[PDB]
């Protein structure tokens, strides 16, 4: 059934929910992209932040998350998590903002047609899509 994991992260999310402390992040980010430890507790964490920084998007984030879709590295393992990850990159922003438009420009500027699926996700959303 439900893995005690969700219950854990859930508590943390409600813990530093309203606290723009550069500490929690200084710990989550690494565990999410410290280029070492597995990618298990990593994926989840990534979402944890998204929930908090759901509104105000930081830099160190989009930076690591971005440098990931490209270099990826964090390859120690693999199974199924690109779904939740991609989702974050989407809600990563508030919604109405050409900011995302620029980002896509970066993903397009670089090869790696593997993330294509994503380009269609974020793209379809926000601007350039509806009609």
């Amino acid at each position: 059934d439900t893995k005690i994991s969700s219950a854990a992260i859930l508590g943390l999310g409600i813990a530093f929910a309203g606290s723009k402390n550069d500490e929690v992040l200084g710990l989550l980010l690494p565990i999410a992209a410290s280029t070492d430890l597995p990618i298990e507790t990593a994926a989840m964490a990534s979402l944890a932040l998204a929930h908090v920084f759901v509104g105000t998007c930081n830099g160190d984030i989009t930076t690591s998350i971005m440098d990931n879709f490209l270099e990826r590295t964090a390859i120690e393992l693999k199974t199924d998590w690109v779904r939740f990850l991609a989702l974050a990159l989407g809600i990563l922003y508030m919604g109405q903002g050409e900011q995302v438009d620029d980002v896509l420009e970066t993903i397009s500027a670089i090869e790696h047609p593997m993330t294509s699926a994503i380009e269609v996700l974020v793209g379809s959303c926000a601007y350039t899509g509806t009609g």
Partner: protein, 76 residues
């Protein structure tokens, strides 16, 4: 020429360079502006990524060009 550098955080930088300038020289100028180490930088421009050594001329990078700068894949 005066080229711009847009970071993935939310800020731009106006650096005065030239065509003969080597990407390496640029990265250095940045390290002096902010504090990011060369071994930890990623410059992208309309075309692809700028490799070290080459010159801004190779990438036909003109003036007022926006350079997408991104840090290495880390956490902190």
């Amino acid at each position: 020429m005066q080229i711009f550098v847009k970071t993935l955080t939310g800020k731009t930088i106006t650096l005065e360079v030239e065509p003969s300038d080597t990407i390496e020289n640029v990265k250095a100028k940045i390290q002096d502006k902010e504090g990011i180490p060369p071994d930890q930088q990623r410059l992208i421009f309309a075309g692809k990524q700028l490799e070290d050594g080459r010159t801004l001329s190779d990438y036909n990078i003109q003036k007022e060009s926006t350079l997408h700068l991104v840090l290495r894949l880390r956490g902190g």
